[PDB]
Amino acid sequence: KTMKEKAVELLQKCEVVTLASVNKEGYPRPVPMSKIAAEGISTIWMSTGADSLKTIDFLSNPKAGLCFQEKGDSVALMGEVEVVTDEKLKQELWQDWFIEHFPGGPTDPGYVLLKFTANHATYWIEGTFIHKKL
Amino acid sequence: TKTMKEKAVELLQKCEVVTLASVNKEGYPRPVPMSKIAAEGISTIWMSTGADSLKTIDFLSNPKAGLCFQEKGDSVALMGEVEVVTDEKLKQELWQDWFIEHFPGGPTDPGYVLLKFTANHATYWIEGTFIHKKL
């Protein structure tokens, strides 16, 4: 019944999100991303190549946006990405099909985690628009 | 054989939704799903929005934009610029019935604005292959 409660319920139904970085040229870069894990709408985990355009963007500019949607309801968060290389986290969040993209396995240095931490939310849910700092 | 560009045009024709990013005044990129109202190849992509929308506010001060779309493991990510358009002729030509729910004044509604995205650069993920080209 709470807006954030509906937004959390919406994230739980979404397996993909769209992640945006800002490149050194100043352009925002939205890319579709598999959602590995999320805690509410506060923290969301993804993986990418250490040499990806995403990674190189985030190493210099942490500012980030992320949206998701299902059945005409949508949410866009703003926040920051931390590029995570921790050996224990890489192992913990490893998934089997990751081997396709990261042939070195869970200790592949070409494998990194992206941790997105939200600071704002814009909700387009069930006829209501709310734009709210978190 | 079709080039990455030609493949992307085909992909787009299948998508009725795209994700559009602006950069807000604080430097944060803001991706949002948008209905694709029309497109000319992948070169020009047309969307609609409110005259007072956050997207309109962002683009009025920073034209730099990003747009992506995806169908079935294949994705395309574009970089370019957005112009906010208020041209009466385009407003009426691009009007869709489902706009009534959003712009109660019709194709003449002062609250009704078009977003013209013009692409500069593409990043293709087609056939599990990544290619990053200037347009």
Instruction: Identify the residue among B15, B17, B19, B98 best suited for mutation to test binding to A, counting A beta carbons within 10 A and taking the highest.
Output: B19
DSSP structural state of residue A105: G
Compute CA A65 distance to the chain's CA centroid, rounded to the nearest angstrom: 8
**Spatial CA neighbour of A122 closest among B31, B98, B20, B19:** B31
> Would the CB atoms of A53 and B19 count as touching at under 8 Å?
no
Give the separation between CA B89 and CA B98, rounded to whole angstroms: 18
CA angle B35–B40–B44, rounded 5-degree value: 70
Q: What sign results for the dihedral spanned by CA atoms A90, A68, B133, B26?
A: negative
Interface test with B, best of A15, A29, A134 (most B CBs within 10 A): A29
Q: Tell me how far apart the alpha carbons of residues A120 and A57 are, in angstroms, rounded to a whole number.
A: 21
User: Could you give the CA distance from residue A16 to residue A120 in angstroms, rounded to a whole number?
Assistant: 19
Rounded distance between C-alpha atoms, residue A114 and residue B47, angstroms: 30
- Flag whether residue A18 sits within 8 Å of chain B, measured between CB atoms: yes
Report the C-alpha gap between B40 and B20 in whole angstroms.
Answer: 17
**Structure solved via:** X-ray
* DSSP conformation class of B69: E
- Residue A75, helix vs strand vs coil: strand
Question: Which domains, and CATH codes, for chain B?
Answer: 1-135 (2.30.110.10)
Judged on CB neighbours under 10 Å (0-12, 13-18, 19+), B51 is middle
Resolution in A: 1.9
What is the distance between the alpha carbons of residues A68 and A15, in angstroms, rounded to a whole number? 9
CB contact under 8 A, A122 and B33: no
| Under 8 Å between Cβ of B70 and B40 | no
